[PDB]
Design a protein around this ligand. Structure first.
Ligand code: PC1
Ligand code: PC1
Ligand code: AMP
Lengths: 120, 98, 55, 53, 347, 69, 320, 50, 140, 101, 49, 459
């Protein structure tokens, strides 16, 4: 539904507006979770090929962790870029059309009528 | 629209009902498939020739071309059956049911 | 009477036997392709004529 | 996933034929060239729903 | 099969899929579909068996009928519209014919009468290639023409697909027919949400592809095509039973597994349109799918079936087969729930 | 026990106030999301739901072989 | 590993390596035909080599330390108890025969891998095409039942269709009385119980149904017992044969590449041995299966793969 | 130390309490701003609560 | 078939009997023709006469189902004088269930059918009253 | 002819013969003694008595005792100025806009 | 010498593990360099230095 | 709540990295450390709940349930460490890991501030119990016990989730700290009727309600006793948490709609007490007693008075402890005699005196002997149901006879009479068993002195 925004300039993973956003820190919990996913994948390779699970192939585990962290960082960058685009289009349309979305006067509780149902 | 358009599309759906109701022979169904493509080709060529769309004139013949590129495949899918069964009856083609 | 039969009958066993019968009737196909394309034809004829999905 | 690589690499594959009002060999117009031009230029970039409405 | 010829065939089918992906012309769409057909046909005949010939004949006839219906829809759209751009269609009958063509190509019910025999008659790698790579191009075409799709038709086809897939999967012992009916159920779940939010369709397609490829890789690794051999896998390796249990739990729709990620959010994009009873019915048929999944898990992992004396020989040789990215696809098929908002990369 | 382990009532009170503020803002933004999506799909004047159309760069403006075009 | 489709793309053609020496030989006959050295004779002067006959513990010798494993881990069967009471209720005879058959499959796979990898002819003993005759003797003493023979025919039918017959097959013809006297002068006390009907039925099914199918797909030379000790006549018969019979001529590089891809993965070979056809003679209990599997796990060199065991003296496992 | 496995859970609890103490720092939107608990910030002080 | 359901719902409920009964009978007849055509499509009849006998059997069963359902709804809504009450449709659903049990010659099937399409008829009635949509149009 | 060859079903293993001092944890006596000491120290001596001391001197649960003290003030106010104890109006009846009737 | 043959994975292939270590180091170095480029381009693009 | 979740997720490698003979000792010690650490949740105020963070909060209601859960884990570990001595070490670690994951999902269930999070982990709890029930049981019917337990509960909640998502489209937030102030009254209509049914039926199945209780006895007579204790004691309380978190939104339509539910619960608790009066298995008898107690809890939360809420929470905690220790009694008997028949092993007081004392204390605490917390909760629910209507006390009174009549009879034929002559493998009391029994019994007596910590969110 954002395809119109991805209409003029296609097949761009991170457009020029994505560089103006704060990138995710390396201590982000999502990045740590994806690194844990890569570590679990390395453990599964140590398990299914009948190898020792916690010592065999440290290079394979490090490669899995690095690849998972790399693709997770780029996917998180794309995710927060898209969510920022969503909120910016939101606020642009809500500045653009005030006739179809008016204001509400929040009444106090001293005059709004409510019906009380007794529990007994 | 017109009249010959009606005749050609009715020929297409007649050949479709011919294909969609088998009569115990694969190559007859292949002939009905090529008839449906004949109606498609005739309709496309007539539509272009009425609308003076010159640059789209490649599309009918190429369409025709690609049909042969599958139709021979259907023939190539016949003799293999004839290399296992004696004949090519579709009621004998019920091994895949378990 | 109640706990072991009737409550055991109304909710789970009727549903299980209904799915038993439905799944038996669905996948008892003979594998013929003439019947399959006849089914495709009557499906197309129902969708085009009775349902009138081109309105 | 309409991966429009025709604009990413800048290579024209099938935009020269897809529309009746395109560039034709030896500059031959079709039977509805002006109507195609009007319908494209009126309904350009404003969205399909607004174009229909 | 010659490795160079096989590589050329694979490059041909991927080229046809890419051509369907990238073209802005209906004729090039049909050309890519024809190339897809003509390249997937010899993949099924790698073993030269009568079952493969029967499956190839059924597949070729059904996809040829779909291709001719697609061409008639294209010609009707041309005659009523005068151009060839891949966008919304300008006729309801052209929309009908293209929807029937894409339903026949996908295998959606009541055009599901070819998927189980085709999956059964071909080997596991060919079944993987079919049930994964043939569900990308028609989804792209349906993504392109979703303005012109009739709502009642696609919703009826979706609910029929899910119900028929569950009822078919309740009564099959072979693994490949189970896969085919599960694919029909996932197809209905995926195409029910197409008109409301196609990003949900793409997300469910990606998750279904990952899970189905994971399961077919596990079946290729165990070299098992029957339920009894799948039960017999417990003696060869316990880890294979653990992964088949967690994966078949994932495709059931249980939290906190990844298979609960798409379907739940399908409801999140259908209660916003005030459609309440339809996701409930599709959740009930998802429970039916979970029931035959639970029977299969009872067969393979949670109860260890008796084995034979020959398997001791298999204890002296490790598995030398090539498991293509098996742990990564298993992890993505199991624990993708805490990364749920990542679907926003598909916008 | 209160000095060593337990949180102060002031800290918990203001933490509750901050949590209430953040979740109220998120709820209001979700309601605006639903209303904005409904209006945008009903009207079509926004960047969302911008369905593709034929580009006008393909129109040839050159003089043709026939004057009537 | 070492071989794959990339190697065939790189140019590894197996027909380059098989010269006129690359002839697959197996020698088969009666129980004590005197071929036990004779096949080895074909090893020691033709530039070939001859593995011993596929016994109960051949797989235990070709994998691991090479020390044959106990009965509980491998086989769970006994040839000697079969020789004492062949009509036992537990079906030890069929278990021993099935283990021998799987051993013969593994032996033939290893020999074919050696032939397709080095281009050297391999001498064998009682190949997989000549084992069923023993089971036919097992059927003609009342030793086993109909269902077990049906299971064996199913197993052989699903595992033999992917292979090729050998180049030449050497048979040694010994009379029943001579081989019976040889058995009585063997001196081993556990083989004093062979009946005459055993060897008579072996020879009957050997000459009746095995010759009119092996003579077309390969070359068979019917020798005799006194001339079986004559190595020169046998080797002169070997060198002056015409290689025109069988499917060994219409096999291009791609067919042998597919054969090598199937063969070098041993679990692909042994996949159809344990088909889920349920037989009281072969089925092992689940508790016993778990106990035996856990017992085999704690054996040295079997807990992990062939080069990932710290208890046998492997280094750099953390870098492997 | 030959008792490394017995100090897993206390280390986890210390880490969890450190994470929680970092977590209330992000929730300082209404610190010394509530209409019922407000008071003047005393000398030789910077925050009302950490 | 888009006009049969609307013509069923174009008449006020419990007011006139035979037109509503015949509308429900026509809907049942269309459903019976559809299911009998599918049954003779996937399952081959042994003969033409047996096939048209099966088609007539399914048509008669579904027509009786629809006719009795519409009838029982009509007299229930007339007797209780409550047009906006789904209990009449539940009673009609049990009447249809007893009809299905009679034509299929079973009793437990009859009771299960009572419960099942009585609940279905009630769900239809509060779907009409509360304006639920089976196929909701896209809004957001 | 025996089906699915299985080891005979094991008997009930008894623990008081090989070790008459066993506490039902395992077979090794040191493991049994350490497990018994661990559970009897960290279950009874550590959670029960210290938890009871913690919940006995818990600092004024839900301010319940405080609910006395302020109340002990409040009536002491309104019994000295003639005010009623409690009123039927929970809030101020003059600060409410009554809806029209 | 325990096993009768030489297993293919019984010897450390130094080229494969060296390539894996080099690829991991390259990926990590590219990741930190990209993160630095992003963070100072973010401070440049808004002037929040 | 990160100071208890991280200890659980960090004890997970501890039970994965432990030695081949010190798994039980290390897991029990560290779980008891977590159990002591869990007492810090009682920092409760009379007005405001202890809101830890955005997605975690714990009022006076869920804190006793959390304390019960991570006190219940070591008891399960001791109660399931006998029969798994012959089981393989990897599968032993798998079982302990399953129990640890079940505890983690349970503690994340009771403190989830958002109702979607609560639902997601409330049936993320479904996987470990299903795995334990189906794998580590002892009969054939455990396979059937994996079906009726599963396809009931999910069938109650796959509607419910949709309803929850609908609230996300209606209110805009499903947070419980927000919905206490944004709640609107529910009008009388068929749509609100079906919303009430969808929001009610999942936890109605999970209590279970009578008619939907068939999954409870079929999943208890075959389980490993760790599974039996977690199912009877803490897994049934998810329905109570669903009631006390959901019933805020379903006012006032609950008052004039819950009549058939209350009728079903009262007459079904009468029926299940009568079924307890004529049982032959210990496990089935305890399960049907649990059905009666949860039907009483259903009535207590459905009438929604503050006294009823106090009684419902007290009865929930007391019944959980009592049912867990009763299942420990039945497991000791089934360990000694290798059968589940009540009439088989009789007169065990002549041979086992301390187990007879624990039997007597279990039976006394089962029939609500004052001043135990069981009597406190049962009495409060009795007075609240008398406040709902008068005639209800008659429908209580017979039950309070019957709930005594089996509660001693189940003792008597198992403990009093002439002992069976042909049974001679009755071993004396293992110290592990009696330590587990005392660890079950002593908190149940201790909570009678200070009941104010387990008296709900409105004490
Ligand atoms: C909690 C929910 C989950 C349940 C499972 C929990 C598992 C973890 C358990 C952790 C340990 C236990 C925690 C709860 C402890 C509760 C007890 C406690 O500490 O209470 C505090 C209460 C505190 O008393 P208090 O509340 O009155 O004191 C007020 C507080 N101060 C002192 C600060 C003003 O202790 C007592 O009441 C003790 C009273 C004295 C001791 C008893 C004397 C009499 C003994 C009997 C004599 C004979 C009588 C006649 C008998 C006739 C035959 C029957
Ligand atoms: C254990 C098995 C039985 C489980 C029973 C569970 C409870 C029974 C009812 C569940 C209905 C499904 C969830 C509905 C949630 C509705 C939320 C809401 O706000 O609704 C208002 C909405 C109102 O529509 P609306 O909100 O879109 O309209 C706008 C508002 N007005 C009306 C003013 C215009 O209700 C509905 O849309 C329909 C609700 C009823 C749904 C009926 C179909 C399902 C029937 C029950 C099936 C149960 C499973 C059976 C199989 C089990 C497995 C074998
Ligand atoms: N399938 C079989 N069935 C019975 N006996 C066999 C089988 N295969 C080999 N043998 C025995 O193995 C021995 C062969 O070794 P040799 O005596 O050196 O030829 C003979 O005692 C054969 O009877």
């Amino acid at each position: 539904m954002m395809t119109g925004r991805q209409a003029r300039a296609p097949l761009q993973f991170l457009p020029d507006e994505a560089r103006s956003l704060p990138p995710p820190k390396l201590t982000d919990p999502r990045l740590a979770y994806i690194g844990f996913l890569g570590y679990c994948s390395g453990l599964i390779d140590n398990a299914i090929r009948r190898r020792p699970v916690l010592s065999a192939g440290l290079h394979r585990q490090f490669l899995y962790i690095t690849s998972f962290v790399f693709v997770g960082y780029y996917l998180l960058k794309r995710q927060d870029y898209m969510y920022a685009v969503r909120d910016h289009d939101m606020f642009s349309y809500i500045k653009s059309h005030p006739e179809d979305f008016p204001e509400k006067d929040k009444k106090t509780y001293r005059e709004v009528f409510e019906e009380f149902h007794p529990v007994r | 629209m017109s009249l010959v358009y009606m005749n050609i599309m009715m020929a297409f759906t007649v050949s479709l009902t011919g294909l969609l109701m088998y009569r115990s022979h694969l190559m007859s169904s292949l002939l009905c498939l090529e008839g449906m493509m004949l109606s498609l080709f005739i309709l496309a060529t007539l539509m272009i020739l009425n609308s003076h769309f010159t640059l789209a004139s490649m599309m009918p013949i190429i369409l025709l071309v690609f049909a042969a590129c599958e139709a021979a495949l259907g023939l190539s899918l016949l003799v293999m059956v004839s290399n296992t069964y004696g004949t090519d009856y579709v009621q004998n083609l019920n091994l895949l049911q378990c | 009477l109640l706990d072991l039969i009737w409550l055991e009958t109304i909710l789970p066993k009727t549903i299980s036997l209904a799915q038993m019968k439905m799944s038996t009737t669905i996948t008892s196909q003979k594998g013929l392709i003439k019947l399959y394309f006849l089914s495709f034809l009557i499906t197309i004829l129902i969708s085009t004529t009775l349902l009138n999905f081109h309105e | 996933p309409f991966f429009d690589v025709q604009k990413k690499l800048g290579v024209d594959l099938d935009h020269w034929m897809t529309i009746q009002s395109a560039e034709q060999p030896h500059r031959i117009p079709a039977r509805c060239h002006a109507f195609e031009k009007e319908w494209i230029e009126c309904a350009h970039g404003i969205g399909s729903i607004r174009a229909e409405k | 099969m010659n490795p160079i010829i096989l590589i050329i065939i694979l490059m041909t089918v991927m080229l046809g899929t890419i051509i369907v992906m990238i073209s802005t012309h209906w004729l090039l769409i049909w050309i890519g579909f024809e190339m897809n057909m003509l390249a997937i046909i010899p993949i099924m005949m790698k073993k030269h068996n009568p079952r493969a010939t029967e499956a190839s004949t059924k597949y070729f006839l059904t996809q040829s009928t779909a291709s001719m219906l697609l061409m008639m829809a294209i010609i009707i759209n041309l005659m009523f519209s005068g151009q060839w751009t891949v966008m919304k269609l300008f006729n309801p009958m052209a929309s009908m014919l293209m929807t029937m063509a894409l339903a026949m190509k996908l295998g959606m019910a009541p055009f599901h009468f070819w998927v189980p025999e085709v999956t059964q008659g071909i080997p596991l790698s060919s079944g993987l290639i079919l049930l994964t790579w043939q569900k990308l191009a028609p989804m792209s075409v349906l993504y392109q023409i979703l303005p012109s799709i009739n709502l009642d038709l696609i919703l009826t086809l979706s609910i029929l697909s899910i119900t028929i897939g569950g009822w078919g999967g309740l009564n099959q012992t072979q693994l490949r027919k189970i896969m085919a009916y599960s694919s029909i159920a996932h197809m209905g779940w995926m195409t029910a949400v197409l008109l409301y939010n196609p990003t949900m369709t793409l997300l469910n397609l990606i998750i279904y592809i990952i899970m189905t490829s994971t399961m077919f890789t596990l079946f290729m690794a165990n070299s098992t095509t029957t339920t009894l051999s799948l039960s017999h896998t417990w003696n060869k390796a316990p880890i294979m039973t653990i992964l088949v249990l967690i994966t078949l739990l994932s495709m059931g729709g249980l939290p906190p597994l990844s298979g609960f990620m798409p379907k739940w959010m399908i409801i999140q994009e259908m209660t916003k349109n005030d459609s309440i009873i339809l996701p409930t019915l599709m959740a009930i048929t998802a429970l039916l799918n979970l029931y035959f999944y639970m029977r299969l898990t009872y067969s393979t992992a949670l109860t260890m079936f008796p084995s034979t004396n020959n398997m001791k020989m298999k204890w002296q040789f490790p598995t030398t087969k090539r498991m293509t990215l098996l742990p990564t696809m298993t992890v993505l098929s199991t624990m993708l729930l805490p990364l749920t908002p990542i679907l926003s990369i598909l916008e | 026990i209160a000095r060593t382990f337990f949180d102060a009532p002031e800290k918990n009170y203001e933490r509750t106030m901050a949590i209430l503020q953040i979740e109220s803002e998120k709820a209001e933004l979700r309601l605006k999301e639903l209303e904005v999506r409904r209006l945008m799909r009903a009207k079509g004047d926004g960047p969302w739901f911008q369905y593709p159309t034929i580009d006008k760069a393909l129109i040839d403006h050159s003089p043709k072989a026939t004057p009537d075009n | 590993l070492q071989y794959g489709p990339l190697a065939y793309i790189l140019g590894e053609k197996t027909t380059k390596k098989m010269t006129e020496n690359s002839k697959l030989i197996t020698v088969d006959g009666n129980i004590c035909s005197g071929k036990s050295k004779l096949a080895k004779e074909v090893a020691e002067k033709l530039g070939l080599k001859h593995f011993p006959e596929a016994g109960i513990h051949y797989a235990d010798s070709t994998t691991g330390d090479g020390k044959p494993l106990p009965v509980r881990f491998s086989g769970n069967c006994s040839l000697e108890k079969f020789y004492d009471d062949p009509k036992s209720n537990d079906g030890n005879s069929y278990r021993l025969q099935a283990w021998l058959y799987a051993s013969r499959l593994l032996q033939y796979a290893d020999a074919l891998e050696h032939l397709l990898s080095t281009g050297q002819g391999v001498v064998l003993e009682r190949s997989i095409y000549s084992d069923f005759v023993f089971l036919e003797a097992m059927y003609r003493q009342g030793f086993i039942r109909k269902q077990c023979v049906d299971h064996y025919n199913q197993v052989k039918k699903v595992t033999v269709c992917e292979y090729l017959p050998p180049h030449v097959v050497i048979y040694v013809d010994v009379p029943v009385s001579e081989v019976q006297s040889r058995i009585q002068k063997k001196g081993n006390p556990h083989e004093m119980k062979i009946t005459s009907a055993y060897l008579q039925d072996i020879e009957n099914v050997y000459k009746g149904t095995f010759l009119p199918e092996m003579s077309e797909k390969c070359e068979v030379l019917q020798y005799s017992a006194w001339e079986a000790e004559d190595a020169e006549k046998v080797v002169e018969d070997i060198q002056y044969l015409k290689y025109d019979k069988g499917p060994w001529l219409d096999q291009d590089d791609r067919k042998l590449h597919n054969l090598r891809m199937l063969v070098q993965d041993k679990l692909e070979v042994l996949n159809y041995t344990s088909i889920p056809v349920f037989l009281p003679e072969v089925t092992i209990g689940a508790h016993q299966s778990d106990r035996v599997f856990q017992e085999f796990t704690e054996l040295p060199g079997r807990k992990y793969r062939a080069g990932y065991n710290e208890d046998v003296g492997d280094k750099w496992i953390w870098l492997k | 130390r030959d008792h490394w496995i017995h100090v897993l859970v206390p280390v986890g609890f210390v880490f969890g309490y450190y994470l929680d103490r970092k977590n209330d720092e992000k929730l300082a939107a209404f610190r010394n701003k509530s209409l019922l608990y407000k008071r003047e910030l005393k000398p030789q002080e910077e925050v009302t609560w950490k | 078939a888009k006009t049969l359901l609307h013509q069923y719902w174009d008449i006020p409920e419990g007011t006139e009997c035979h037109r509503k009964t015949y509308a429900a009978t026509s809907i049942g007849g269309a459903s019976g023709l559809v299911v009998s055509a599918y049954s003779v499509a996937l399952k081959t009849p042994t003969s033409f006469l047996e096939g048209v006998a099966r088609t007539g059997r399914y048509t008669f069963t579904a027509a009786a189902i629809g006719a009795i359902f519409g009838l029982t709804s009509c007299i229930s809504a007339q007797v209780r004088e409550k047009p906006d009450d789904p209990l009449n449709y539940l009673i009609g659903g049990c009447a249809g269930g007893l009809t299905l049990g009679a034509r299929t010659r079973s009793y437990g099937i009859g009771a299960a059918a009572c419960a099942y399409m009585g609940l279905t008829a009630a769900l239809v009635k509060m779907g009409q009253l509360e304006g639920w949509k089976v196929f909701a149009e896209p809004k957001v | 002819t025996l089906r699915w060859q299985e080891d005979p079903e094991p008997e009930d293993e008894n623990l008081y013969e090989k070790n008459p001092d066993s506490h039902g944890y395992d077979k090794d006596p040191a493991v049994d003694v350490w497990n018994m000491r661990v559970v009897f120290f960290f279950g009874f001596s550590i959670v029960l008595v210290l938890g009871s001391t913690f919940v006995a001197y818990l600092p004024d649960y839900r301010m319940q005792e405080w609910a006395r003290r302020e109340a002990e003030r409040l009536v002491k106010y309104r019994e000295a100025h003639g005010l009623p104890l409690m009123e039927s109006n929970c809030f101020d009846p003059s600060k409410i806009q009554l809806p029209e009737d | 010498k325990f096993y009768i043959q030489e297993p293919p994975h019984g010897s450390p292939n130094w080229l494969k593990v060296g390539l894996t270590l080099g690829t991991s180091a390259f990926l990590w170095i590219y990741l930190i360099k990209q993160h630095n480029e992003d963070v100072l381009e973010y401070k440049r693009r808004n002037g929040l230095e | 709540m990160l100071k208890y979740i991280i200890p659980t997720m960090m004890l997970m490698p501890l039970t994965w990295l432990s030695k081949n003979s010190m798994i039980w000792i290390n897991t029990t010690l560290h779980s008891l450390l977590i159990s002591l650490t869990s007492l810090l949740l009682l920092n409760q105020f009379g007005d405001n709940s202890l809101n830890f963070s955005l997605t975690f909060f714990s009022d006076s209601l869920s804190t006793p349930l959390l304390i019960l859960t991570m006190w219940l884990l070591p008891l399960m570990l001791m109660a399931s460490q006998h029969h798994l001595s012959k089981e393989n070490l990897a599968r032993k670690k798998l079982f302990i890991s399953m129990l640890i994951l079940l505890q983690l999902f349970l503690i994340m269930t009771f403190t989830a501030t958002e109702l979607i999070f609560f639902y997601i982990m409330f049936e993320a709890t479904l996987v470990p119990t299903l795995i334990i029930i189906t794998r580590w049981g002892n009969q054939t019917e455990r396979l059937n016990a994996g079906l009726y337990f599963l396809f009931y509960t999910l069938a109650g909640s796959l509607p419910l989730l949709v309803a929850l998502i609908y609230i996300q489209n209606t209110m805009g937030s499903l947070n419980f700290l927000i919905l206490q102030y944004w709640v609107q009254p529910m009008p009388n209509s068929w749509s609100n009727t079906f919303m009430w049914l969808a929001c009610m039926m999942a936890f109605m199945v999970k209590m279970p309600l009578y008619g939907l209780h068939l999954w409870l006895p079929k999943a208890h007579v075959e389980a490993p006793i760790a599974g039996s204790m977690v199912l009877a004691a803490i897994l049934l309380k998810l329905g109570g948490y669903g009631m006390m978190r959901i019933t805020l939104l379903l006012n006032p339509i609950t008052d004039f709609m819950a009549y058939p539910f209350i009728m079903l619960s009262l007459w079904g608790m009468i029926m299940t007490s009568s079924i307890c009066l004529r049982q032959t298995d210990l496990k089935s008898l305890i399960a049907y007693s649990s059905v009666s107690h949860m039907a009483l809890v259903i009535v207590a939360i459905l009438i929604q008075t503050p006294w009823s809420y106090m009684g419902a929470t007290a009865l929930m905690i007391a019944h959980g402890l009592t049912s867990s220790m009763l299942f420990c009694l039945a497991n000791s008997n089934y360990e000694r005699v290798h059968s589940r028949t009540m009439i088989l092993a009789r007169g065990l007081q002549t041979l086992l005196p301390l187990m007879a004392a624990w039997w007597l204390l279990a039976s006394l605490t089962n029939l609500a002997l004052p001043p135990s917390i069981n009597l406190i909760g049962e009495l409060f629910v009795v007075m609240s149901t008398f406040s709902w209507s008068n005639i209800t006390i008659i429908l209580m009174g017979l039950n309070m006879v019957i709930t005594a009549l089996y509660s001693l009879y189940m003792l008597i034929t198992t403990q009093r009479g002439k002992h069976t002559h042909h049974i001679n493998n009755i071993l004396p009391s293992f110290t592990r068993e009696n330590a587990l029994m005392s660890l079950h019994m002593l908190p149940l007596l201790l909570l009678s002195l200070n009941p104010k910590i387990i008296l709900g969110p409105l004490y």
